UniProtKB/Swiss-Prot annotation, chain A:
Residues 1-56 bind DNA. Catalytic component of the RAG complex, a multiprotein complex that mediates the DNA cleavage phase during V(D)J recombination. V(D)J recombination assembles a diverse repertoire of immunoglobulin and T-cell receptor genes in developing B and T-lymphocytes through rearrangement of different V (variable), in some cases D (diversity), and J (joining) gene segments. In the RAG complex, RAG1 mediates the DNA-binding to the conserved recombination signal sequences (RSS) and catalyzes the DNA cleavage activities by introducing a double-strand break between the RSS and the adjacent coding segment. The chain holds residues 401 to 720 of 1040 of the full protein. Changing residue 1 to A: Allows robust hairpin activity. Homodimer. Component of the RAG complex composed of core components RAG1 and RAG2, and associated component HMGB1 or HMGB2. Interacts with DCAF1, leading to recruitment of the CUL4A-RBX1-DDB1-DCAF1/VPRBP complex to ubiquitinate proteins and limit error-prone repair during V(D)J recombination. The RING-type zinc finger mediates the E3 ubiquitin-protein ligase activity. The NBD (nonamer binding) DNA-binding domain mediates the specific binding to the nonamer RSS motif by forming a tightly interwoven homodimer that binds and synapses 2 nonamer elements, with each NBD making contact with both DNA molecules. Each RSS is composed of well-conserved heptamer (consensus 5'-CACAGTG-3') and nonamer (consensus 5'-ACAAAAACC-3') sequences separated by a spacer of either 12 bp or 23 bp. It comes from Mus musculus. Autoubiquitinated in the presence of CDC34/UBCH3. Maturing lymphoid cells and central nervous system. Changing residue 160 to A: Loss of DNA-binding. It comes from the Eukaryota. A divalent metal cation binds at residues 200, 308. It is found in: Nucleus. This is V(D)J recombination-activating protein 1. The gene is Rag1.
UniProtKB/Swiss-Prot annotation, chain B:
The RING-type zinc finger mediates the E3 ubiquitin-protein ligase activity. It comes from Mus musculus. A divalent metal cation binds at residues 200, 308, 562. Changing residue 200 to A: Loss of cleavage and strand transfer activities. Binds 1 divalent metal cation per subunit. Mg(2+) or Mn(2+). The gene is Rag1. This is V(D)J recombination-activating protein 1.
Amino acid sequence: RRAQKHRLRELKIQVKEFADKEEGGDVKAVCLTLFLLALRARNEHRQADELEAIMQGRGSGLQPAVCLAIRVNTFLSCSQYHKMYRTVKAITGRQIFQPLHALRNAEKVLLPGYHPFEWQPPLKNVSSRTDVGIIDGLSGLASSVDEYPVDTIAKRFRYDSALVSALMDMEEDILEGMRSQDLDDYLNGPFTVVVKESCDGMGDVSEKHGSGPAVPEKAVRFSFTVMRITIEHGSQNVKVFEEPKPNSELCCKPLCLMLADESDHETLTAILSPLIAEREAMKSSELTLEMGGIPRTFKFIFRGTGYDEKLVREVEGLEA
Amino acid sequence: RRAQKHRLRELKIQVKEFADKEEGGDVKAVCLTLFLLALRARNEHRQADELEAIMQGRGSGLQPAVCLAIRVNTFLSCSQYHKMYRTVKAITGRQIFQPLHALRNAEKVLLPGYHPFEWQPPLKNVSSRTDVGIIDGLSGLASSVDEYPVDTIAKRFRYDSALVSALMDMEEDILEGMRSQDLDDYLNGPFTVVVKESCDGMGDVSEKHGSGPAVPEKAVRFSFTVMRITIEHGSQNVKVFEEPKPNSELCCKPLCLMLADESDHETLTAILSPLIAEREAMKSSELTLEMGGIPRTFKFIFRGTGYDEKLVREVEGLEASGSVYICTLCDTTRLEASQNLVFHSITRSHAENLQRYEVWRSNPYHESVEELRDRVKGVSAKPFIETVPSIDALHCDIGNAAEFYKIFQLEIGEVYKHPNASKEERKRWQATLDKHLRKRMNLKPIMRMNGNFARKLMTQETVDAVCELIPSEERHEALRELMDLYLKMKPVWRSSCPAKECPESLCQYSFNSQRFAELLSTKFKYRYEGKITNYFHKTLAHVPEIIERDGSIGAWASEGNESGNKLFRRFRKMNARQSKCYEMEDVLKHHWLYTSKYLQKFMNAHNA
DNA sequence: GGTTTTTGTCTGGCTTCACACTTGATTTGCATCACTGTG
DNA sequence: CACAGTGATACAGCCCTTAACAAAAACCCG
DNA sequence: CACAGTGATGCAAATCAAGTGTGAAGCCAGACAAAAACC
DNA sequence: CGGGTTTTTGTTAAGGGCTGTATCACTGTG
Ligand SMILES: [Ca+2]
Ligand SMILES: [Ca+2]
Ligand SMILES: [Zn+2]
């Protein structure tokens, strides 16, 4: 490297002084172009195509989004992925899989708290901030010695931000659906979105050791799916996206996981009150989101169909 | 392509004149150097390495062996690997990975039954064929409706085939160790191989649907691992290998997997008889096997230590498990063991148990039931598996920790002043002990005691948190000193090399044992007058003798077999066919592939 | 209209990739089989 | 002293620019 | 009428290795000649 | 045999950016 730099001590100087004049000072692009022309003069076309793919990250590389998709949908843990990446490094020599920090950087885009959303009218009792991530499910429940004892752990997502992330994960799907029925592409009619929220407790979940309250060995999950999305066109309505597998495990997007008891009622109400408040506030509100270069509005219709009979009774008044 | 030549016309002239006058005339090469310099300055070393690889010899494409190694060690299943390979191919273009059929072809080298071998003394009662794979564990037992009913599903490797597969998987480690010992390389002396047999029966395995016998919901695994390999040189032998993690899940090798009850002696013996026949046949023979192009001979020394207390009682011939004869190494009654607590001797063996069964059956002296049992020292059944006298470290620790838990539960109630207590009092003692244990050291209450619970409860903070609930001070000091004694005792029978990393502890074990025994006999007369646990008996009597006889206690423990049991459920649920007739075979093959070591060095290529 | 950029061509000569036929010889892809797991 | 995870976080290693100087290996010829 | 596995088996589709003479395409030489977006 | 010339490789310190590994309290099969 040092010998090449010392021999090439001037060539960089005049190529950069020309780049400052002809282009602006982008030495990498002009050097790549000159290499491509040199290869063409030497008559290698497949090699030039491969180099172009490499510069575009197609011939190799496996972009971090693709690597994260592989790791997540292959049910591979982070440590196992690191082992596989390290051994592929050592053997092949190139970088076929991306590093864990790159995966984690690409992770933040899909998680809630990255896109900007504005409400009109603003949601009642819901903050207008657009960077809320994983918040405590207790909603700041009083946990001193003087009040009702708390023995639950709950991490939950704000309902509106979670809906924004779920809608943005299917941006291409919504565009394709709107293209399929020969509608426009920049149409910004008010979308009508129906969401099936399902809550069901579990049993025989092993309580762990470690610092925390006397947590019972029961877990209650809250989740929602996006069933269908429609736009208002002309006098009637037309569907854009319909889930082909409504009962699959790939559509039951989680919302709020608390390791509490289903039979216990006070803690259940305390933890699930904020979500119901947000849902009631959003029942009559309009969500604005920058959907692929054109702002479009959203509407929400909620159906609580995914409850078993015992929880339905325990919630909606009925006894036993 | 054409509209970009008129920015480069005014530059290629000086580029090529410089190349002619200084480099020699090459333009593509000098531009390669310039582009590498620019890319490395821009901090695009990934692209720089890709360009270097593509311009140099193309290293694209992984070997089927390394693909299989990744697929097995990264805990992956065939369908997930297939979709990973499909997406990688479809996106990258070139086929970096290798297909499932190629991986399946490449995995026949490691599985037993593909390499040639022979025995210099022809083994008795077993075929010399060298192309046997997974053979039925039932050994062709009669399944006719008229015969004794069968309810077991067993798939099994032949013992010598598994041994030769393991040995020439071990081949390159053996060669590397031989080089590292400053010896020759092509020497072919009588190798001695020491292997460890571990057997344990599990529970709560979910029986599947489908055609098959009335199989129970219990499983028994029979696994072995290679510990030491030695070869003779002049007047001494050299340690050609030594297992670094004898208790890991990467060393125990599955050999015979069956779904049968541990205590169902009928089917247990029915399935394990061929294994003992093979062990007896090959315990007095010699194996000739090529090793890197040069034949080498193998001797075998066989030891059984991976057996739990109940399984030793069942297969060695002791009464049931409780009896009055408590130890599996010495013939001493529970009361006599409770009064002596110090001095004993290891005096049981498989041949002694066989002859004692012969005496019990024939009754050569015309004597009654009680006196005959007294003469036969509790042997009331004929043994069928040879096991050496040893101690299972994990179960010993678990039992000792449970006993200490009960001692704390009693002491927080001061039973020494209240000889009579009620069930409500005992329940309240248990509840307060659990609450304060949680509050102080933060352990949840459990009903079956684990080993992590043992390790966390065997601390000084434990006796601290207990004694802050005991009003008296004499109990405080007694518990503290007993706890210190136990912590000084534990390292000896839990370390891989007791004679290396714990010399002072090993030396002081005897004095600590005497102090512990007399402390119990004096300050704990309310628990240990006329009765003591077999695990305390073992720890206080037999551990130094076993150290002197063997070399280490704990390297032969059942930690590896427990880890294999952990792997068994994962393999059954994600890496095996979900049918009652092929699941066991698939689990056996995948577990053998995982425990293979040729597929493990590939994932440690980063240190090369 | 001026100015600059962007494509187009010119003929002889060079290299570089695809194929024209045939017969095997592999490698690779995907459907089938009776089952599980969370209730 | 069971041993291989399990994932987020933070610090260390390696390497790029500036520019002038220093230690070291290969031929030429008196 | 849940749905994503679970791995071995087996047949069908795809790719290729062997022989040399073609075509078909990209590019090199330095120079001349029309379209198109800002004034 | 050794200056003399030419070429190869490294070195000093201030910053930026990617990459690798140790650390934290825990898990499970018992
Ligand atoms: Ca349920
Ligand atoms: Ca067991
Ligand atoms: Zn004993």
